[PDB]
Amino acid sequence: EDMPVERILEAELAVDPVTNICQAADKQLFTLVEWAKRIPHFSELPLDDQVILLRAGWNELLIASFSHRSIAVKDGILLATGLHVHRNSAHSAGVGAIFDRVLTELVSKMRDMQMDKTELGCLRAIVLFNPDSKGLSNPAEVEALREKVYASLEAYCKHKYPEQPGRFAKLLLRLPALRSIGLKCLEHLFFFKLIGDTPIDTFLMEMLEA
């Protein structure tokens, strides 16, 4: 393979509740860039394209990471700073609806299929190599890199989990739900910026302009 899954996994290994969540997002935005640089072939792309891919995917990439990290906890989410947020804090803050979708469409499904870190890292790399991002200099080579992750992930799943054929599909069919959840989170965040509700720190603010 040209997109080995070992260097994907190595990237994973290497790295008010709305206020706390936003704070953790800002923190993880710095570490997200470091993750992406470690993904085979991403750092090779033109800078402008690197910028485009991360601005398009950041919200989904981060939601995927904390969702996986939160398999262990009972009705709730482990933030990167170490604080938990639980369904009750979530609902008492006016964001229960979206918090519930995260728990049910992401955390629970990751837990009930027992996604591992290689699988997470690959899914995140697919999200990163989104060839439909507006303004890419060369859509074709991002498509080509996605296709390499798809091929490497499929051969990881046949090899490691040969008891289940509908498992490559099962993993990929978390991505549409991640996109709908991600769009709803962005909606909220533009709305949190708009009224000044919550303090949005520097890097997170940058991801929310145009």
């Binding site: 697919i126 507006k134 499929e154 509908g166 490559f168 599909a169 990929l172 709908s180 709803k184």
Partner: protein, 219 residues
């Protein structure tokens, strides 16, 4: 190898896409108003087509009488985008484009829309692939307002299995053609999210989406 029930189950499905129907006298029916009315009439009719396609999917009619309705509201947009992509990529269609351009669609929704149509028409889909992918879209368990999710999930499963074997058999040369279709599912979600707005930011002739569309998409 080909599936346990094989072609039999896919041929039962494809006769709903045989019932895929558009008889006309070259559609007798030029202006942004007129173009809008034509598109509305096509959308309403494709709603009817889609409702028929749904009842014949394995296990559909059995499952819960309310959550039944929910899937159609949640998926109809995506099915209509897929269908439009199919329509738009043909020579026999070409001036379908002119109607969508001059229909008062707020300018932002143009370019992404025609870009998605292009990504679809680079994937060399085939009826079976359109039919199956549409069925997969409809039986998505992760839509708003549902209690019987696990049950939806089980009806969906064997469709993925059939689709995977079909994309090896038909398109072995692009091996990941199977997974690439799934990545169009992801991208359909961006259109489903924006649609309530697109409709709302739609410049018309002081009218409204014909009663069925007003219901399926509310207000």
């Amino acid at each position: 190898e080909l599936t346990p029930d094989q072609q039999t189950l896919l041929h039962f499905i494809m006769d709903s896409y045989n019932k895929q129907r558009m008889p006309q006298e070259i559609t007798n029916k030029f202006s942004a108003e007129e173009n809008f009315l034509i598109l509305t009439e096509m959308a309403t009719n494709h709603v009817q087509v889609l409702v028929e396609f749904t009842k014949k999917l394995p296990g559909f009619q059995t499952l819960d009488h309310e959550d039944q309705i929910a899937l159609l509201k949640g998926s109809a947009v995506e099915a209509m985008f897929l269908r439009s992509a199919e329509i738009f990529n043909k020579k026999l269609s070409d001036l379908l484009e002119e109607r969508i351009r001059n229909s008062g669609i707020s300018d932002e929704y143009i370019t992404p829309m025609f870009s998605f149509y292009k990504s679809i028409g680079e994937l060399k889909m085939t009826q079976e692939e359109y039919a199956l992918l549409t069925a997969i879209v409809i039986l998505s368990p992760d839509r708003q307002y549902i209690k019987d999710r696990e049950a939806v999930e089980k009806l969906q499963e064997p469709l993925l299995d059939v689709l995977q074997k079909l994309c090896k058999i038909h398109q072995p040369e692009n091996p990941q053609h199977f997974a690439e279709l799934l990545g169009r599912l992801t991208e359909l979600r961006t259109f489903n999210h924006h649609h309530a707005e697109m409709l709302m930011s739609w410049r018309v002739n002081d009218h409204k989406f014909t009663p069925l569309l007003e219901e399926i998409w509310d207000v």
